[PDB]
Amino acid sequence: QDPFEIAVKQLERAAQYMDISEEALEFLKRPQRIVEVSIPVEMDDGSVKVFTGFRVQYNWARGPTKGGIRWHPEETLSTVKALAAWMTWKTAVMDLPYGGGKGGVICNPKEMSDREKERLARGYVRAIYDVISPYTDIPAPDVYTNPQIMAWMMDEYETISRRKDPSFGVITGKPPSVGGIVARMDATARGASYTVREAAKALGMDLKGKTIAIQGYGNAGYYMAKIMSEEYGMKVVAVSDTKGGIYNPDGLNADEVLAWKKKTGSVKDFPGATNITNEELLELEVDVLAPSAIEEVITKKNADNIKAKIVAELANGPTTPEADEILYEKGILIIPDFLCNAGGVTVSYFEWVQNITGDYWTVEETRAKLDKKMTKAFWDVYNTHKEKNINMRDAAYVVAVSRVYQAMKDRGWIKK
Amino acid sequence: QDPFEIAVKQLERAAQYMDISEEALEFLKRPQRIVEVSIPVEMDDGSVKVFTGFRVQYNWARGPTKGGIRWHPEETLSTVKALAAWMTWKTAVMDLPYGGGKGGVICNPKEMSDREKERLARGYVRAIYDVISPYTDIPAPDVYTNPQIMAWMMDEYETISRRKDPSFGVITGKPPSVGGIVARMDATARGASYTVREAAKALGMDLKGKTIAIQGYGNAGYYMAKIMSEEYGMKVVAVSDTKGGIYNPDGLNADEVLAWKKKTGSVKDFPGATNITNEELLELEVDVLAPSAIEEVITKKNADNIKAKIVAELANGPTTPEADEILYEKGILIIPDFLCNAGGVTVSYFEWVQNITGDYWTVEETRAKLDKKMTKAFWDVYNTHKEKNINMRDAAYVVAVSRVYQAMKDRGWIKK
Amino acid sequence: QDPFEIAVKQLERAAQYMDISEEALEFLKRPQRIVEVSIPVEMDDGSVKVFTGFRVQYNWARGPTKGGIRWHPEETLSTVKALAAWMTWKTAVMDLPYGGGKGGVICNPKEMSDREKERLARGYVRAIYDVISPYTDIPAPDVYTNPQIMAWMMDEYETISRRKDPSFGVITGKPPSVGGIVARMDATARGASYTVREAAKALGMDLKGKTIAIQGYGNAGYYMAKIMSEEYGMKVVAVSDTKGGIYNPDGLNADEVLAWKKKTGSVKDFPGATNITNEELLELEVDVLAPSAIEEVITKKNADNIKAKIVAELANGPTTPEADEILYEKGILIIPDFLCNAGGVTVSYFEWVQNITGDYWTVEETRAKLDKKMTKAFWDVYNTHKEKNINMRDAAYVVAVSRVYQAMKDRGWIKK
Amino acid sequence: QDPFEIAVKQLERAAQYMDISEEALEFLKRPQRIVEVSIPVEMDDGSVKVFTGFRVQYNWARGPTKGGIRWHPEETLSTVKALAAWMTWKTAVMDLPYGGGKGGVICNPKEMSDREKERLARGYVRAIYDVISPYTDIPAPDVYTNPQIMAWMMDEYETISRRKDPSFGVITGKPPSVGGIVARMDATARGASYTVREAAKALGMDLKGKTIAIQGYGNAGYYMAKIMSEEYGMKVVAVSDTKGGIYNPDGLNADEVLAWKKKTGSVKDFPGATNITNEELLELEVDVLAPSAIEEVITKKNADNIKAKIVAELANGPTTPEADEILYEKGILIIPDFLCNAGGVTVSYFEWVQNITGDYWTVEETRAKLDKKMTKAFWDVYNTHKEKNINMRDAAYVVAVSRVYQAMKDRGWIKK
């Protein structure tokens, strides 16, 4: 289905950049396992309503599959399969010991009691219990799920598993009271702060003094802002939200802007600052550009106007194939999302290790370990893009895919 | 899909005839669990080929799900989802401590070597292992599957189960050398005869000397012929097949016939028997009509021409809805398929029992248990329709869907 | 080795009387699994002593392996290997759902306190626990082990299994207080009579008023004596023991003889009776000759002096091959031990079914089923011996090994 | 058996240097568990051929048993029991949390195709599955087995295990695409060098600029040469191979030497270097000597001509007991094999640690620990040598055997 169909293509295109049997391609083109279940839920009004959820375990050749759970009224399998495939390249490029998986339920949390959300989380686990474990498949939070939901879900598992395993490790995005971890607050942006630093290096450029413009002012946007300016000494001249951007040559203060938005509801009309549009933002003359909100914000239409040296993809899919070629030719360094925003998944892996080892780390320890991980994944991609003459996004899928190809071979899943 | 769709709207129509919640109905409108997997197989040519299969566990309120595995190049989940629902109403009417399930693989058996197939049978199991046990889900042979393939499936199960359970009972239609049973050759026809026999009873009639025309001369028809005439003293006046049929008001001799066709290739041109057509046969003037070949062969078109005292549905969906209603006012007793041809699964239950208890029975024993079973089911249905003034098929679903509704209710799956 | 080597030869030979692959042959010339253990035991003198035990599971293609455990100071793996193979042909011919196994520990049960043996019994179990279960491997008592011993074994088991399975069923030969059954007392002699009953028909002869001479007066002998006379109305003109025999054409009374021996230590000097040697008894001119004491009593040297119609081997290996021929071409009906004396292994299987089903039968039921089972097996072999012009012993191996052959095939362990 | 026998004596002689119960002795004199299976394999020609393999779990008092698998046509159980015994002292001396075990299959890799060796690795596993686990028994590569065979093994385990545990940790020497590691390549030569440092220290000597001679030039020999000279600053004055040696006072350049051997076929004739025989090598006048190829090269015969300060045993069994006392008397530091060559097993435990915790370390981290572990182990052995005043080989065995003794005492396996 379209969403999946798009995924395969992504894949089918990268092969061309590498040596890989067809036995392989054929395998890597369908998910290893799909589970589809009916979850009867008792609604507040005493009525029992049946939902439909999925869990897809795409490929586990490299490790147990990692992947979040989504709650969404317009959810579909294809979507789930497609996103499962994706995690797969994600974990691989990051070189973690996991395969990729993903789940979803077709429901409207927005019309749900806290108590009806608890019973759906429980029903999910009761339904797909037989394919999850701390060593088989480890979920986590996605669209419309959060730590609270994770905990109810861990809790129902222990009740079934009866504690004969490291129960806290069957799922991540947990609240700290139960094996969850801090450091997970800034992960994505923080992780993203490390590629950029590296990216700078590549271009033999020093960040201090440089400029950044961030589209979107949420967690990522908020944190990416605080960090780049605080730790890297960059100038945050532009930030933006759902309602407009505000520009300032002298550099904004994330905490201040944050307060305004939190009291005013928007970053817009922030005193001392000029109001601007979002498209305006994309087209600024800044060193780094961090699209951290929505997708397809950079297209053939605008691709031509982007004046950033580095385009940091914190959100998923801001850029388009078309926009891809132009920015390449144009000479702009792009940190594909799935490499740029992978500190999320990385930390999650850091959480699992702590749950299974029973040993808890300090934030510092945890940040150090995150840096290393990102630091390598980048160079790994960059160097490949150079050598093979392909953009970072193509480079990235080549790094990813081969890793899965090898493992599949070593196990003898395919002979060649 | 269509097929599923079809199936579903057959449930909705019978609903009309009974008192059942909408909680129940919605519930019974979806399978509880579906597993879809890709099974990599090593070709006899050192190539690895990924295949696609499903196991769908519809409903297990009344006991473990029981159902066959189909190997076909035109197979689809929708078909599997649909037959799995069917299996679910079959066991219930039959009153087996089972639920309904089905499986399928998309592959062309015909161009596969014995070795390739063993590798397929084994991979299936290695893939859906986690959801099968002698207590969870118990497969059986279906289209393009048989007792050898079953043996291979049971064997790889034992190897993973490590023999910590009653492994012979994890699948049915097994070769006697391995928990298999012999009463299994004439089960479908043997089970049908009992209903005809009980059918005759209600119809204040005696089949001795009575006539019967049978559509199709495969296993079921051959044996239907054989027994009816042989244990009952009926007059097979015509048989019929793929190509055409044979008439003889004096009584054909099945065995003779079978030879001919075996030697001949068809039941066509038999000595001393006049040639005729399939359609001719249906409107033939006999006391019993046993369509045992294909789908829809009794429709609105000919419905009025059927002059049978009794129509024994041996095949899957031979008659039709409006065809259904005409024969009804006309006063014709129809033995709805899932009840009529259910002996085969009733016998496979008998097999599972023996497997679980280590205690093996005698054909005579087995038979007496079949009869007993076939009988009550018949009656159970007969009285429902009488009392509720509806058609047998309608009455069947009623008795069927009724027992499944009770069970989920008692489990608390649905509150009313 | 020796007894093993001998064993294997036994095999190869009968092969020649049948059609079978070398794949197969080669497969049946070795046990699938052998386990050898070191068992620390706490002696009564405060010192720990390591013993050495084994369990050998020869072939489990037809079901879980069944076989006793021997406690002997002169025990060796070979002996064990060799009897496990024998256990294999015994179940097949008895047509049981069992494979074949045997176990053994090297020790002197005679210098052992009751407490030391218990600690040994529990250690064996704590040692080979990972490969036994009521669905995997089911021991029983053999040389120097008994019910007391089985219970101690059964108990340790439950203690490890945690009662998560039909625990009483993991081992046979138990006291009635825990799953033991009662018809087990005269089983071996009882099952032997049935065969004697059937053989007398094969010969067209009414045993009533006929004669039987029994070599050995143990439980087996005593019961054979008791039954054949009381139930089949025969005359026991001679019985015998460790020290000598007694003769009396008018026929003896099994009980009277038994009490003398108890009070007197031997059958010798029994009143009214005539004293004779064992050899004499062997050469008596009786209808039925029941050798139930030791092997190699019927040799090349005396096969010519044997004058019985039927030679009922209650004992294990009383006749030899060389004696085999002579007695064959001489026209004597020999009932192979392994069929003749399978009454014990049969009722044992009857014990397991009641343990796993939780249903327990009466003595009359059990006996009922025991006769049906023995009867068939006789005729199976009888008919085979007729058809191929071979001797019961050779017939027997043919039936057994063929049966294990089909199963390994159906499972695809070997492909031809 | 001769080889097992030899081992037993090896131990009994160490007894003599320490206080050990006799209860302990006898326990240690036998392996706790031996399993022997018949493994049917589908030959490339369509025939099935049954192979024979074993796994020997010697003693687990200190942890789960660690030990390689050997593929070889002249393999014997006793060789196996013997090596397992050996594994047992090697882990204890290293103070690793394991017992010792060994496995082996009788076959000729060297006429098996890759598809046959895969069907072979897989069947091993399917066979001894019940006694292996990442917590129970952890195999590894040995004679004629490599990371690829490990991976095939790990895979079938996962297929049986169902991923309910840290599947990557049930076996070591894995390819990195699946739990394997690096820093595993120079493990042996690298571990050996730390002990060589320590010694130097014991001796008060400073290695920079001292001389070393290596008998043998394979991986270890090659690696020993690169390391001592590059990291320690030593002069490699002679190396030698299967055919002969070469000598040169200024120092050889290991890479230059290796290419020459690689392109040429031997170290013989290396340009600018003098040729010498192996024996002359041994009696060379160097500070350090490193026999790293074949056994019994140091005998009563030449023991007297050894002129080195330290004898680093990279090979197994290069010095005899006889040569053992002469050298000892002469005052030469000998670093025993099983201690000196332990950097391999050590690094194999490091892999298991990473597999079980999901955390993968850096080479520098890995090296940090190896150093530590070998360092400690060296001194534990040394210090027992001066103390009890015995030879390193004797001293290592005491430390080993004592450790195993305490544990069996602390568990109550034996009472004193």
- Domains contained in chain D, CATH given: 33-178 (3.40.50.10860), 179-415 (3.40.50.720)
Which residue matches tokens 């996962």?
A: D158
Whole-number Å distance between alpha carbons of A85 and A82: 5
Max Cα–Cα distance, chain C, nearest Å:
65
Q: Which residues contact D214 (CB under 8 A, 6 or more apart)?
A: D221, D224, D225, D236, D238, D239, D240, D290, D292, D314
Interface of B with A (CB under 8 A): 23, 26-27, 30-38, 40, 42, 46-50, 52, 127, 130-131, 413-415
Of B94, B106, B91, nearest in space to B143 by CA: B106
Main-chain dihedrals φ then ψ at residue A377, nearest 5 degrees? -55, -35
Q: Are A94 and A82 within 8 A, CB to CB?
A: no
Interface of A with D (CB under 8 A): 60-64, 97, 133, 135-136, 349, 352-353, 356-357, 403, 406-407, 409-413
Question: DSSP letters along D208-254, please?
Answer: TT-EEEEE--SHHHHHHHHHHHHTS--EEEEEE-SS-EEE-TT---H
Q: Which residues of B touch C406 (CB under 8 A)?
A: 175, 177
Whole-number Å distance between alpha carbons of C151 and C148: 5
Structure tokens at C250: 């008018």
Main-chain dihedrals φ then ψ at residue D206, nearest 5 degrees? -115, 115
Whole-number Å distance between alpha carbons of A350 and A367: 10
Going by their DSSP bridges, the two strands B48-59 and B288-291 should be labelled as unpaired
Going by their DSSP bridges, the two strands A288-291 and A211-215 should be labelled as parallel
Please report the beta strands in C148-192, taking only residues with DSSP state E, as ranges in sequence order. Answer: none
CA atoms within 13 A on the CB side of D227: 21
Cα B141 to chain center, whole Å?
11
Which residue matches tokens 């053992």?
A: D324
Helix or strand holding residue D13 (H, E): helix D2-15
CA distances from residue C278 to C43, C215, C217, C281 in whole angstroms, order as listed: 42, 7, 12, 5
3-state secondary structure of B271: coil
Whole-number Å distance between alpha carbons of D289 and A65: 50
Of A261, A249, A245, A187, nearest in space to A212 by CA: A249
- Contact at CB, A34 and B33, closer than 8 angstroms: no
Structure tokens at C61: 């293609």
Q: b/e string for C20-46 if b means 16 or more Cβ within 10 A?
A: bbebbbbbbbbbbbbbbbbbbbbeeee
Cross-chain CB nearest to B159 (options D46, D126, D162): D126
- For chain D, breaks with the C atom over 2.5 A from the next N come after none
Structure tokens at B268: 């066509």
Whole-number Å distance between alpha carbons of D216 and D278: 9
Main-chain dihedrals φ then ψ at residue D283, nearest 5 degrees? -90, 10
Angle between helices D77-93 and D392-410 (to 10 degrees): 90
**Determined by which method?**
X-ray
Whole-number Å distance between alpha carbons of D119 and A412: 11
Long-range CB contacts (< 8 A, 24+ apart) of B121-125? B121/B149, B121/B152, B121/B153, B121/B156, B122/B152, B122/B153, B122/B155, B122/B156, B123/B39, B123/B40, B123/B41, B123/B51, B124/B39, B124/B53, B124/B69, B124/B153, B125/B153, B125/B156, B125/B157, B125/B160
Angle between helices A343-357 and A363-388 (to 10 degrees): 130
- Contact at CB, B166 and C135, closer than 8 angstroms: yes
Q: Which residues of D touch B160 (CB under 8 A)?
A: 159-160, 162
Main-chain dihedrals φ then ψ at residue D297, nearest 5 degrees? -120, -20
Specify burial of residue D412 (Cβ count, 10 A radius: 0-12, 13-18, 19+): exposed
3-state secondary structure of D206: coil
**Number of Cβ within a 10 Å radius of residue C176:** 11
Whole-number Å distance between alpha carbons of D107 and D124: 12
Q: Is residue A219 annotated as involved in ligand binding?
A: yes
Q: Which residues contact D6 (CB under 8 A, 6 or more apart)?
A: D82
Going by their DSSP bridges, the two strands C288-291 and C274-276 should be labelled as unpaired
Structure tokens at B251: 């009584």
Main-chain dihedrals φ then ψ at residue A290, nearest 5 degrees? -110, 90
Q: Which residues contact C306 (CB under 8 A, 6 or more apart)?
A: C282, C283, C289, C298, C323, C327, C330, C332
Cross-chain CB nearest to C38 (options D32, D42, D46): D32
Structure tokens at C46: 């405060």
Distance from CA of C348 to the nearest CA of D (A): 27
DSSP state of C411: T
Q: Is residue D99 annotated as involved in ligand binding?
A: no
Specify burial of residue D176 (Cβ count, 10 A radius: 0-12, 13-18, 19+): middle
Going by their DSSP bridges, the two strands C99-106 and C48-59 should be labelled as antiparallel
Mutate to test the interface with D, among C20, C21, C36 (most CBs of D within 10 A): C36
Max Cα–Cα distance, chain D, nearest Å:
66
3-state secondary structure of A365: helix
CA distances from residue D376 to D36, D290, D373, D403 in whole angstroms, order as listed: 37, 21, 5, 15
Q: Are D332 and D310 within 8 A, CB to CB?
A: yes
Residues belonging to chain A: 416
Mutate to test the interface with B, among D133, D159, D162 (most CBs of B within 10 A): D159
Whole-number Å distance between alpha carbons of D142 and B93: 61
Catalytic residue among A81, A90, A102, A235: A102
Structure tokens at C396: 């027997």
Structure tokens at D185: 């390549």
Q: Are B238 and B270 within 8 A, CB to CB?
A: no
Encoded amino acid at B381, one letter: V
DSSP state of C255: H
Which residue matches tokens 């545990």?
A: D165
Q: Which residues of A touch B34 (CB under 8 A)?
A: 34-37
Whole-number Å distance between alpha carbons of D126 and B158: 11
Q: Is residue C216 annotated as involved in ligand binding?
A: yes
Cross-chain CB nearest to D160 (options B115, B130, B160): B160
Q: Are D160 and D132 within 8 A, CB to CB?
A: no
- Contact at CB, D151 and A62, closer than 8 angstroms: no
Q: Is residue B221 annotated as involved in ligand binding?
A: yes
Of D97, D88, D104, nearest in space to D11 by CA: D88
Of B23, B20, B15, B27, nearest in space to A47 by CA: B23
Q: Are D346 and D370 within 8 A, CB to CB?
A: yes
Mutate to test the interface with A, among B35, B52, B80 (most CBs of A within 10 A): B35
B touches A (3+ CB pairs < 8 Å)?
yes
Q: b/e string for B278-309 if b means 16 or more Cβ within 10 A?
A: beebbbbebbbbbbbbeeebbeeeebeebebb
Q: Which residues contact B407 (CB under 8 A, 6 or more apart)?
A: B61, B62
Of D88, D159, D95, D84, nearest in space to D123 by CA: D159
DSSP state of A50: E
Q: In DSSP terms, which residues pair with C137 in a beta bridge?
A: C65, C133
Distance from CA of D46 to the nearest CA of B (A): 9
Whole-number Å distance between alpha carbons of C212 and C190: 15
Cross-chain CB nearest to B27 (options A30, A33, A50): A50
3-state secondary structure of A71: strand
All partners of chain B with 3 or more CB pairs under 8 angstroms = A, C, D
Angle at D293 between CA D291 and CA D296, to 5 degrees: 70
Q: b/e string for B224-250 if b means 16 or more Cβ within 10 A?
A: bbbbbbeebebbbbbbbbeebbbbbee
Whole-number Å distance between alpha carbons of D113 and D44: 8
Q: Is the dihedral of CA D405, D406, D412, D416 positive or negative?
A: positive
Resolution in A: 2.5
Q: Are A183 and A347 within 8 A, CB to CB?
A: yes
Distance from CA of D48 to the nearest CA of C (A): 6
Whole-number Å distance between alpha carbons of A342 and D245: 55
Whole-number Å distance between alpha carbons of B407 and D25: 64
Q: Are D211 and D179 within 8 A, CB to CB?
A: no
Structure tokens at A72: 């969404």
Encoded amino acid at A284, one letter: L
Please report the beta strands in D85-179, taking only residues with DSSP state E, as ranges in sequence order. Answer: 99-106, 137-138
All partners of chain D with 3 or more CB pairs under 8 angstroms = A, B, C
Angle at B290 between CA B284 and CA B296, to 5 degrees: 90
Interface of B with D (CB under 8 A): 46, 115, 126, 129-130, 159-160, 162
Of B246, B248, B203, B198, nearest in space to B221 by CA: B246
Residue of A nearest to D114 (CA): A415
Distance from CA of A394 to the nearest CA of D (A): 21
Instruction: Let me know if D102 is a catalytic residue.
Output: yes
Whole-number Å distance between alpha carbons of B185 and C177: 43
Whole-number Å distance between alpha carbons of A25 and A195: 30
Please report the beta strands in D253-380, taking only residues with DSSP state E, as ranges in sequence order. Answer: 274-276, 288-291, 310-312, 333-335
Main-chain dihedrals φ then ψ at residue C217, nearest 5 degrees? -135, 65
Of C284, C289, C307, C298, nearest in space to C234 by CA: C289
Whole-number Å distance between alpha carbons of C7 and C386: 25
Q: b/e string for C129-142 if b means 16 or more Cβ within 10 A?
A: eebbbbbbbbbbbb
Cross-chain CB nearest to D415 (options C36, C37, C48): C48
Structure tokens at B43: 């070709």
Whole-number Å distance between alpha carbons of C93 and C82: 17
Whole-number Å distance between alpha carbons of B28 and D306: 87
First to last CA, chain C: 28
Whole-number Å distance between alpha carbons of A392 and A27: 25
Catalytic residue among B66, B102, B117, B210: B102
Of B376, B380, B377, B396, nearest in space to B334 by CA: B396
- Contact at CB, A97 and D358, closer than 8 angstroms: yes
Q: Are A67 and A32 within 8 A, CB to CB?
A: no
